[PDB]
């Protein structure tokens, strides 16, 4: 659909375009509008019909390309250890992101569960005394158990063993020669631990 | 005199208290200071979702307002966290009792493309059929059309712009601009020359650089503040002018000096208009009366409703793409009011009525200066980007409990 002298828009690999329309294409619709453009009858009250039905809404733009999002998971999560026993995450709500250009303090990324009855959306400048110390929070900040992700082999070993099972931490030491002068002394001693012992 | 100092002190105190109260009223706040003030702001339809990443990337079209420097049409990138990543049990602050911690997670706002532009960018709008094509209103009579794909990422070493298309027909600067969502290449512009210009750039040759006006409408007797195509009809378009008049024009009508319909919309200058996406008959116009009038196309003599909670002139009015009952309006009063149509004529408690009319839903007073232009995100609901006169761009979203409840 090249318009004039301009090339058509090129959708990239992970690109999504918001829908150009929010309602199904009704064919006669436009023509009917023409009639309602000419009649100018005050019969219809839109606000009256608004309260008698549910508002028309649309969701966030999702991907719909053919064969777009197909993935594979080769890991099963095994959780071991009590840790600290933090409260349930679900009862804390969405994590709010609050960042400011003039704040030396880094961006805030976390939940907010404080409750007030006076900080209203109808009045953003509504003070809430004794609910939050009305001072700058930036100047003070100006100065500054186990969740294993087992693979198939590790999952089989965990099933065979149990909770006592732990993943393997491979230990490899590179080619360390006696002629090497810049070689690490730690690896040198670890390999000297296997030094040959001669018998006379 | 002392008026400027008093205003500055009051605005600074209001910004401080608003910043303190922002956790209760917002789920997303991103304050960014641009190099130059932007008179325009429009979300691009592109959203990139890199697989394996907990964020999406949106794009914004902005302008520059330089008193004595080279102006640029700007395309900028904004990173927004994914919905699935908004629930994360990373750290638990034992003191505040929240799953918070400032950490290192932050929204990345950076400029992607800068293009030269002779004079300030009054308003920049992209063609829906092709987001690569962007139309800009200059302080001159001509209207510029760019294809940012055919331009370098960094601007020219010197010299003014090299527009892909130059549109003639006007005789003074303007601010109202709209593409036709049903006819590709049909562009409408409104200027102080009391006329509305219509161009059809769908048949421009490859080497064609200047396009003359296809049609000129002269119904308005004052400065035509804004013009906007109808979202579903390829022949109807609305316009609001300084003559307190809103005109609905039909392109099939041969009389280009008399609109198909005329309405005395307001008692003073009407600066903007917008069509509801979910209703072919309903539109809204923001005036200098500090009011937003709701108009039904089936009955133009009677005003459906008048939103009255702004403290000064209103310059931009835009609907919510994801909700027909949600409207927004900004102006010189440094406030962005979000209204709910479903709350019109509802019984309100005496103390709640102190704050405003029942249809008023949210107030965005995070701007320290006049809000130049705001825009709704078409991909992320309730996300609004607003640019003000003090080179401040804010991409924000009010709290979920405010609208969902």
């Amino acid at each position: 659909g090249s318009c004039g002298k301009f090339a058509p828009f090129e959708i990239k690999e992970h690109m999504v375009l918001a829908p150009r329309r929010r309602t199904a294409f009704h064919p006669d619709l436009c023509s009917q509008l023409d009639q309602l453009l000419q009649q100018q009858s005050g019969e219809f009250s839109f606000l009256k019909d608004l309260k008698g039905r549910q508002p028309l809404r649309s969701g966030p733009t999702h991907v719909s390309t053919r064969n777009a999002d197909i993935f594979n998971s080769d890991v099963v999560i095994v959780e071991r250890g009590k840790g600290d026993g933090v409260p349930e995450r679900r009862k804390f709500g969405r994590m709010k992101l609050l960042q400011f250009c003039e704040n030396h303090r880094p961006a805030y990324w976390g939940t907010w569960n404080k409750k007030t009855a006076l900080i209203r959306a109808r009045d953003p400048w509504a003070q809430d005394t004794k609910l939050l110390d009305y001072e700058v929070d930036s100047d003070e900040e100006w100065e500054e158990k186990v969740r294993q992700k087992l693979k198939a082999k590790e999952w089989d070993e965990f099933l065979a063993k149990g909770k006592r099972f732990r993943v393997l931490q491979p230990v490899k030491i590179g080619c360390v020669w006696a002629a090497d002068r810049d070689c690490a002394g730690d690896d040198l001693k670890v390999l000297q631990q296997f030094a040959a012992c001669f018998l006379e | 005199a002392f008026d400027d100092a008093v205003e500055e002190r009051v605005i600074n105190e209001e910004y401080k208290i608003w910043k303190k109260n922002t956790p209760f009223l917002y789920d997303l706040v991103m304050t960014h200071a641009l190099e130059w003030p932007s008179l325009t702001a429009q979300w691009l339809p592109d959203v990139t979702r890199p697989e394996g990443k907990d964020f999406s990337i949106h794009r914004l079209v902005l302008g520059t307002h330089t008193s004595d420097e080279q102006n640029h049409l700007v395309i900028a990138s904004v990173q927004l966290p994914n919905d699935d990543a908004q629930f994360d049990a990373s750290h638990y602050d034992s003191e505040k009792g929240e799953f918070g911690g400032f950490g290192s997670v932050s929204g990345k706002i950076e400029i992607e493309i800068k293009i030269n532009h002779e004079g300030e960018v009054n308003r920049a709008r992209y063609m829906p059929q092709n987001p690569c094509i962007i139309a800009t209103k200059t302080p001159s009579s001509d209207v510029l059309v760019f294809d940012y794909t055919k331009h370098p990422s960094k601007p020219d070493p010197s010299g003014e712009c090299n527009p892909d298309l130059r549109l003639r027909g006007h005789q003074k600067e303007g601010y109202g601009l709209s593409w036709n969502p049903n006819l590709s290449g049909h562009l409408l512009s409104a200027s102080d020359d009391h006329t509305i210009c219509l161009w059809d750039i769908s048949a421009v040759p490859k080497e064609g650089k200047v396009v003359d006006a296809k049609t000129i409408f002269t119904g308005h007797t004052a400065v035509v503040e804004d013009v906007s195509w109808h979202l579903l009809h390829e022949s109807l378009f609305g316009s609001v002018a300084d003559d307190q008049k809103l005109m609905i024009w039909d392109t099939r009508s041969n009389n280009t000096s008399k609109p198909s319909h005329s309405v005395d919309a307001h008692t003073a200058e009407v600066n903007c208009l917008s069509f509801n996406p979910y209703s072919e008959f309903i539109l809204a116009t923001g005036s200098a009366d500090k009011t937003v009038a709701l108009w039904d196309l089936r009955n133009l003599k009677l005003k459906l409703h008048s939103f009255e909670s702004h403290k000064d002139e209103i310059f931009q009015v835009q609907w919510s793409p994801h909700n027909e009952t949600i409207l927004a309006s900004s102006g010189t009063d440094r406030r962005l009011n979000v209204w709910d149509l479903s709350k019109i004529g509802e019984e309100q408690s005496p103390e709640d009525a102190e704050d405003g009319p029942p249809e008023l839903l949210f107030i965005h007073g995070g701007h320290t200066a006049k809000i130049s232009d705001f825009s709704w995100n078409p991909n992320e609901p309730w996300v609004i980007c607003s640019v003000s006169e003090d080179n401040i761009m804010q991409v924000w979203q009010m709290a979920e409990n405010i609208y969902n409840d």
Binding site: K172, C175, V176, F194, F198 | -
Partner: protein, 382 residues
């Protein structure tokens, strides 16, 4: 060096007991053979990718075995594949090119060496390729005529399972390690026991008595194998599964014997932790590295040889002249290692363990050393 652990089971997650590269290869891509409990002998193609990581290509599957296959060995020419298992019969395979849907290439049995009573655990080829030696659970090590396909000699002096056999490259001896903590060296011509090595003295007793203990490990070892090996030049014999009593405790080690005398080792390479079970030497003679002129070298010759000793959960990479090993790898498999095998060029060291997965240790160009221009000629006795 690089370690690439194969995360895909070669033998249906059954334990893999043996590995061997095709010794006849002379290029860059090598052929490997694996034996497992699934009664299969699988031949694969191994080559380094553009990035330097080893890549395995499946070539053929040999399912003629009816029980677990424990030992797989390629002939020195790489033409004959010897496979032994719990069925007590050794199969000799050759490429079936006219002189099986899963196979890219085909192999067929040429000889079925019968004469063993129990599971076959180790096999070693002779240099000429016309003689073979095999060890089995039946307490006998059998020497076979490859050309005739018939049994030629039986050694029944063992008192338990025979878990390792090596053939002298100079054609003078055959070395067997059995579960009775006894090392036996048979004269290749007399067909009798030439040397018997079981005990070793350490230091001097507190009262001046001769404090002598047993060199080798008891049956407590988890590995079926005790695969000792001769040096490619034949100068040294490396026998794993040994014990050294440094003090009041014991330590696992690998003993190194010389041709000068076979009843006492020159030295022992200690492996604290698990016991050593396999020994395999790189077939490439390397030039001597510039090093201090100490008597550290196991043998003083104008060349050196790199070898590897595999314990239950680790692999140690030694050379000739140095004392400490130049390489160490561990914690790559969840169970006991079963076998190791070098490639023809020395670029690959394949390790197979009893958890069903194998791994490779890869060396880049001239990383192990500088190969000799001419491989030294051997002074065979015969």
């Amino acid at each position: 060096m690089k370690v690439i652990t194969c995360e895909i089971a070669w033998h249906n997650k059954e334990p893999v007991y043996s590995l061997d590269f095709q010794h006849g290869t002379a290029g860059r891509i090598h052929r490997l053979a694996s034996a497992g409990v699934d009664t299969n002998v699988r031949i694969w193609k191994v080559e380094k990718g553009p990035d330097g990581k080893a890549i395995v290509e499946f070539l053929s599957n040999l399912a003629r075995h009816t029980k677990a296959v424990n030992v797989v060995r390629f002939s020195p020419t790489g033409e004959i594949l010897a496979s032994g298992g719990d069925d007590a019969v050794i199969l000799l395979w050759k490429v079936n090119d006219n002189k099986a849907q899963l196979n890219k290439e085909n192999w067929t049995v040429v000889k079925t060496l019968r004469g063993h009573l129990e599971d076959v655990y180790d096999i070693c080829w002779a240099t000429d390729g016309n003689l073979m030696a095999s060890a089995s659970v039946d307490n006998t090590a059998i020497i076979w005529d490859v050309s005739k396909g018939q049994k030629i000699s039986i050694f029944n002096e063992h008192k338990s399972y025979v878990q390792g056999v090596t053939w002298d490259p100079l054609g003078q001896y055959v070395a067997t390690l059995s579960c009775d903590r006894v090392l036996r060296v048979y004269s290749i011509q007399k067909k009798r026991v030439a040397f018997n090595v079981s005990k070793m003295l350490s230091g001097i007793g507190a009262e001046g008595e001769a404090r002598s203990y047993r060199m080798f490990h008891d049956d407590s070892m988890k590995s079926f194998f005790r695969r000792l090996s001769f040096t490619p030049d034949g100068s040294l014999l490396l026998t794993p599964a040994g014990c050294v009593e440094s003090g009041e405790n014991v330590m696992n080690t690998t003993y190194v014997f010389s041709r000068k005398n076979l009843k006492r080792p020159i030295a022992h390479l200690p492996c604290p932790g698990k016991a050593t079970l396999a020994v395999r030497c790189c077939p490439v003679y390397f030039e001597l590295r510039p090093v201090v002129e100490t008597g550290v070298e196991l043998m003083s010759l104008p060349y050196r040889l790199v070898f590897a000793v595999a314990s239950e959960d680790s692999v140690l990479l030694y050379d000739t002249q140095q004392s400490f090993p130049f390489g160490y790898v561990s914690n790559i498999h969840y169970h006991t290692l079963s076998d190791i095998s070098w490639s023809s060029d020395g670029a690959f060291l394949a390790i197979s363990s009893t958890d069903g997965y194998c791994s490779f240790v890869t060396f880049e160009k001239d990383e192990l050393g500088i190969p000799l221009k001419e491989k030294p000629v051997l002074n065979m006795r015969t």
